[PDB]
Amino acid sequence: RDTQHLTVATLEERPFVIVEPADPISGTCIRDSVPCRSQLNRPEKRCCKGFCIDILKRLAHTIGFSYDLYLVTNGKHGKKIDGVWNGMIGEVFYQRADMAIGSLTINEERSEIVDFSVPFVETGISVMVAR
Amino acid sequence: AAEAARLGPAVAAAVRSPGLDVRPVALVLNGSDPRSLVLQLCDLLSGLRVHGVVFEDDSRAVAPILDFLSAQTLPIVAVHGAALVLTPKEKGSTFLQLGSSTEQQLQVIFEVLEEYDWTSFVAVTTRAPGHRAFLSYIEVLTDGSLVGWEHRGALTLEAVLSAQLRSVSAQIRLLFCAREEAEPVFRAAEEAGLTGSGYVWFMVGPQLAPLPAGLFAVRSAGWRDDLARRVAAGVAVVARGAQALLRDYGFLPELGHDCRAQNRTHRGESLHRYFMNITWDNRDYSFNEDGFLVNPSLVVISLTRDRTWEVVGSWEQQTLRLKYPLWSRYGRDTQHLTVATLEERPFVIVEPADPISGTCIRDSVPCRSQLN
Amino acid sequence: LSTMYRHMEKHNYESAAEAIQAVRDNKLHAFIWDSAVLEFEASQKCDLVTTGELFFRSGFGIGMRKDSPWKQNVSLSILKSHENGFMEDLDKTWVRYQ
Amino acid sequence: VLSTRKHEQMFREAVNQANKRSWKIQLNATSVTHKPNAIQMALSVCEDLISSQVYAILVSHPPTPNDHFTPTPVSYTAGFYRIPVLGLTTRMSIYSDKSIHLSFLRTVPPYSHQSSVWFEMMRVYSWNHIILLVSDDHEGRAAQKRLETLLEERESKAEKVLQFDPGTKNVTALLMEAKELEARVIILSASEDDAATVYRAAAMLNMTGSGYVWLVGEREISGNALRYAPDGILQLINGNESAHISDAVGVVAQAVHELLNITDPPRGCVGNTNIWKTGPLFKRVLMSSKYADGVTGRVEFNEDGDRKFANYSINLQNRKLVQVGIYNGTHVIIWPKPRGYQMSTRLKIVTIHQEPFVYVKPTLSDGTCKEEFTVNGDPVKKVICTGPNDTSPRHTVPQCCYGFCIDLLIKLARTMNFTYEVHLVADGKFGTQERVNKKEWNGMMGELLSGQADMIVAPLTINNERAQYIEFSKPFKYQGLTILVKKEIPS
Numbered sequence A: 001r002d003t004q005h006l007t008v009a010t011l012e013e014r015p016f017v018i019v020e021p022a023d024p025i026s027g028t029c030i031r032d033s034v035p036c037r038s039q040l041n042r043p044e045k046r047c048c049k050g051f052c053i054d055i056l057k058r059l060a061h062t063i064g065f066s067y068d069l070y071l072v073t074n075g076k077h078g079k080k081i082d083g084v085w086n087g088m089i090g091e092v093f094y095q096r097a098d099m100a101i102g103s104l105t106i107n108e109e110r111s112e113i114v115d116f117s118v119p120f121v122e123t124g125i126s127v128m129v130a131r
Numbered sequence B: 001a002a003e004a005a006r007l008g009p010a011v012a013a014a015v016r017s018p019g020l021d022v023r024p025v026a027l028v029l030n031g032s033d034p035r036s037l038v039l040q041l042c043d044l045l046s047g048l049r050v051h052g053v054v055f056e057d058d059s060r061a062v063a064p065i066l067d068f069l070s071a072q073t074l075p076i077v078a079v080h081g082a083a084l085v086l087t088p089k090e091k092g093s094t095f096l097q098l099g100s101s102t103e104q105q106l107q108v109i110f111e112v113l114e115e116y117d118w119t120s121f122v123a124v125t126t127r128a129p130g131h132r133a134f135l136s137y138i139e140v141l142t143d144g145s146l147v148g149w150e151h152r153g154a155l156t157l158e159a160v161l162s163a164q165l166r167s168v169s170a171q172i173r174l175l176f177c178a179r180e181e182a183e184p185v186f187r188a189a190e191e192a193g194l195t196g197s198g199y200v201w202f203m204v205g206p207q208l209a210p211l212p213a214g215l216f217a218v219r220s221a222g223w224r225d226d227l228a229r230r231v232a233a234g235v236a237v238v239a240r241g242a243q244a245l246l247r248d249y250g251f252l253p254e255l256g257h258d259c260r261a262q263n264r265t266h267r268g269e270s271l272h273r274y275f276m277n278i279t280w281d282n283r284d285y286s287f288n289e290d291g292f293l294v295n296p297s298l299v300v301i302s303l304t305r306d307r308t309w310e311v312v313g314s315w316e317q318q319t320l321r322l323k324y325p326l327w328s329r330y331g332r333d334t335q336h337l338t339v340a341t342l343e344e345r346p347f348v349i350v351e352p353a354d355p356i357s358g359t360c361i362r363d364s365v366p367c368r369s370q371l372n
Numbered sequence C: 001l002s003t004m005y006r007h008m009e010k011h012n013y014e015s016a017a018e019a020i021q022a023v024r025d026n027k028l029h030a031f032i033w034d035s036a037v038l039e040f041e042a043s044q045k046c047d048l049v050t051t052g053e054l055f056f057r058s059g060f061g062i063g064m065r066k067d068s069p070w071k072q073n074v075s076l077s078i079l080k081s082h083e084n085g086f087m088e089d090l091d092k093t094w095v096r097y098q
Numbered sequence D: 001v002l003s004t005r006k007h008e009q010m011f012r013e014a015v016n017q018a019n020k021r022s023w024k025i026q027l028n029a030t031s032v033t034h035k036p037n038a039i040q041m042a043l044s045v046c047e048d049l050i051s052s053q054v055y056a057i058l059v060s061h062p063p064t065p066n067d068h069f070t071p072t073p074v075s076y077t078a079g080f081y082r083i084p085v086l087g088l089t090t091r092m093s094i095y096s097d098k099s100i101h102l103s104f105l106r107t108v109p110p111y112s113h114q115s116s117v118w119f120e121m122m123r124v125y126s127w128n129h130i131i132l133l134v135s136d137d138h139e140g141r142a143a144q145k146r147l148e149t150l151l152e153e154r155e156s157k158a159e160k161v162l163q164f165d166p167g168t169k170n171v172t173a174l175l176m177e178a179k180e181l182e183a184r185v186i187i188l189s190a191s192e193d194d195a196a197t198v199y200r201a202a203a204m205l206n207m208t209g210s211g212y213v214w215l216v217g218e219r220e221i222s223g224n225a226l227r228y229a230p231d232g233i234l235q236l237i238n239g240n241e242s243a244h245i246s247d248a249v250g251v252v253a254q255a256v257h258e259l260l261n262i263t264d265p266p267r268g269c270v271g272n273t274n275i276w277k278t279g280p281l282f283k284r285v286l287m288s289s290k291y292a293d294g295v296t297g298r299v300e301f302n303e304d305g306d307r308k309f310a311n312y313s314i315n316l317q318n319r320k321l322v323q324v325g326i327y328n329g330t331h332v333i334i335w336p337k338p339r340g341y342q343m344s345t346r347l348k349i350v351t352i353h354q355e356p357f358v359y360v361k362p363t364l365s366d367g368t369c370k371e372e373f374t375v376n377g378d379p380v381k382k383v384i385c386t387g388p389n390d391t392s393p394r395h396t397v398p399q400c401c402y403g404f405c406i407d408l409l410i411k412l413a414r415t416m417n418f419t420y421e422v423h424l425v426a427d428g429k430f431g432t433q434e435r436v437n438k439k440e441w442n443g444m445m446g447e448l449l450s451g452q453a454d455m456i457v458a459p460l461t462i463n464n465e466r467a468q469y470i471e472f473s474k475p476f477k478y479q480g481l482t483i484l485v486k487k488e489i490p491s
């Protein structure tokens, strides 16, 4: 279009971003999700829904977006290795995307390397045991 | 108007200590050779020390020459449109004006528009001087409060203008152009099917095809004043200023009057504090240093089907006095269904919306009653 | 809930501890305030209790003027303190254990 | 209308070179020297419009007595006759408004346009802050308005725009409000005499900030002020006059050729109050006229009626005139350049009494309140905080503040190397928007936004209506609104 159309990378976290194959004969899912491609470097077009996708849709409606989900493959979330960054945060650090919706806990190193937005749900290390 | 100024009723109205010559200009020469008139009035002021000034010529561009004359010398007051236009001027001129500023007209119009129909919407204005300031004041005065906004309607002036004019849909419209430029716009609107009872046009510019019945304008309170009355009022104002400066300062100086002199000192430019407090004819004149009067008396008038202007509303002391009722609308005809109801406490609750402000919280709808 | 707001205009305590002291007696039945204060008051008074579930769950925050160079470094230091366990120790020292 | 009677000598040759290149009529050009009698020029222009039937007038005059005197009466006469007049050697911003001068077209950019040049220079070195010092005159106000709107376009409020009173001695008090700031980038825009006076005042007061970044206008770097000029950075080619005169003559000739539609000039200067109906169209076509063959570069204009894309020459290396910078219309160890802003280390912090977070306790007779030990046998850090008494006057008495946020502040100070001086709020309310009599902030937000504050270390919530004007750090405690009630008594 060039300012707009931010490419959005995400990941499959079952509480938040659920990915399902949208091939019930028709080439789409129910009118509650958003089409999601993948990466390889005609792939089957999955589609994502849940919590974070709802936030993405509402934000697109409000501020004005033209997004395209970019389900990531090279690692999960992110962890610096051997002086290089992989995963979702690693991809955002390099010139490959401009937003990384999904489950992405905000830490010190990531915030130093990649500027974050305002948190919208609490999180942290918590422990669960059988009972 | 030689007979009206011959007796000088202002002399009887106001009596002072100095000579107080009856004739302000002593020469009705606002015609051929304006430069010769300027020279003779300067000579007369230098010689006889006159104490009056009148500019009666409804030619509309005559303000700048009067400003230059004031800078070269004595305050100049126009009575009648020399004073009908208000513009920023050099501090070296003691110009005196009787008209209403564009900002004051905007504030009066937007105060009266809060009763009948609160939708400014169309704000069409041509490429004319002061249009940017008018748009800026439109933007400022609509911040907060309750007035809605629909469009801006920038255009330059037939059919191509008619299409742009009809592009924006509204009921109340504001026009800003010159008096000569007004007629083409009205012709285009009539050709565009807009000059009807379903629309009202607010002629807000400094002025003063048949005009539509919905033509509301705002002018000063002295619009209906007689020429002798206006001359007397101006003479009274200048006399009050002179007496105030002579009494408060405790001195009797000369108000310049060194017309066409040589190597005149420019240290003294003008003074305006002496005219801050004026009261005459039960009217309060503030006379701000720019040239206009703070909180003046204004009249909102309308154009009837007989092409005769009538006094519709009065604006004074931040107060609006009107005559017509308020109800809802002039009639848009399919829409606007009148809805009758009743007070059933579970369902339709009625409360008096007078907590100082004339409305309730932003959760209800205004409700009138009936009396017949 | 705009009408609700009207009911809060007749009474609006121009303080914070004053309203709690008033609630200590029967002059103001229900108080509405940030949880991190009411919880401590309940723990340290043994007479007032918190009812309902949390709503408008937006946290505190150090402020700074718009377009200021301190934003990045202050946010970084706050996050490092959160991870370091300093904030937990501070909360234990000054809020809990009453 | 002519300077030194030398331009008029070549005016006939310039007209003839452009007259035929033809037909139509042949306009005769007449020039009259400027006079102080304010009467002779009226007769001269009347004769010119009566016999020669002049379709335009030209303005060009040396400094002489005050510059904004000479062109005003001729512009007024033109406005009376609604005849366009081309001005030269004058760049006063007062002529930029057509309300007073309906018929006045200026071919030289005014001082207000230099705001765009200053913006470009700011973009050159990427300065995120700026200080404005403009004279309290029409030109200064116009320049300040232009710079303010241009900067607010990029979503950044100007930091400390100030006003300086013109024609006033001992303006050092203004420097009193211009010394404890946080930016070294300052822009000065005043009259040449005013600039010289303020430069001399800085010279005797010797706090000139020499060797630091300054941005001034062409008038401020004039030769009169150059005698006492401190370290400077704006030169314009026009300051030739003959080239501009030839360009204007060519523009007039092109307009006349394209004019071929009444175009009846006023034969009688006096005795007629009517105006030229063709005059507005004439002014419109000059405004829309394009002259790409101008000697002095491109001769494009703008909506206001002033020429654009001019010649901009940029350091004051001992009265040097080196144009190191590169800018022509659209070409978008310390310079007498370093970072524009220097961060402060004396942050003033605002805090509000909240029971679990910021305990406030009265001090002791000596001056410092009694030291206390925690249950774990560790000292409790407390800071002397200056705050109001009572809630009834407003008397400030130093108490001592401690608790949670004070501990956090101390840790921040240790980890950041910056001193602090805490200072409680006055009203006592946290902060909200309130209508006055336009809406204004009141509370702690009032102190932070414009008052005496730099940070607000207090239990401040985060929401949309607050983050618009205040930057919020990342949260340091999570919570939510909840309701407190009295427990029922229990046998």
Ligand SMILES: *[C@@H]1O[C@H](CO)[C@@H](O[C@@H]2O[C@H](CO)[C@@H](O)[C@H](O)[C@H]2NC(C)=O)[C@H](O)[C@H]1NC(C)=O
Residues within 6 Å of the ligand: C069, C070, C073, D343
């Ligand atoms: C934010 O903090 C960082 C680290 O404490 C600062 O980074 C250094 O700051 C010093 C002094 O300002 C510079 O000389 C160094 O070049 C910076 N980088 C490094 C790697 O040391 C940074 O300046 C701080 N920013 C602000 C606005 O205070």
Ligand SMILES: *[C@@H]1O[C@H](CO)[C@@H](O)[C@H](O)[C@H]1NC(C)=O
Residues within 6 Å of the ligand: D028, D029, D030, D031, D052
């Ligand atoms: C042109 O104007 C000048 C003005 O001084 C006059 O002397 C000259 O006679 C005029 N010539 C013609 C041909 O009009």
Ligand SMILES: *[C@@H]1O[C@H](CO)[C@@H](O)[C@H](O)[C@H]1NC(C)=O
Residues within 6 Å of the ligand: D170, D171, D172, D173, D176
């Ligand atoms: C000039 O202004 C400064 C700052 O207010 C003041 O200290 C000084 O006394 C003033 N000098 C004169 C002569 O007014």
Ligand SMILES: *[C@@H]1O[C@H](CO)[C@@H](O)[C@H](O)[C@H]1NC(C)=O
Residues within 6 Å of the ligand: D295, D296, D297, D298, D310, D311, D312, D313, D327, D328
């Ligand atoms: C700007 O470009 C024009 C057109 O080539 C030229 O006439 C003028 O001298 C240039 N000015 C500068 C300062 O480079």
Ligand SMILES: *[C@@H]1O[C@H](CO)[C@@H](O)[C@H](O)[C@H]1NC(C)=O
Residues within 6 Å of the ligand: D362, D389, D390, D395, D397
């Ligand atoms: C401030 O208030 C304290 C309260 O104990 C009191 O002791 C002190 O005298 C007051 N000081 C002033 C100046 O009012």
Ligand SMILES: *[C@@H]1O[C@H](CO)[C@@H](O)[C@H](O)[C@H]1NC(C)=O
Residues within 6 Å of the ligand: D345, D417, D418
């Ligand atoms: C702390 O700041 C002061 C003043 O800016 C400076 O003199 C000192 O060197 C700094 N120390 C450190 C460790 O940054």
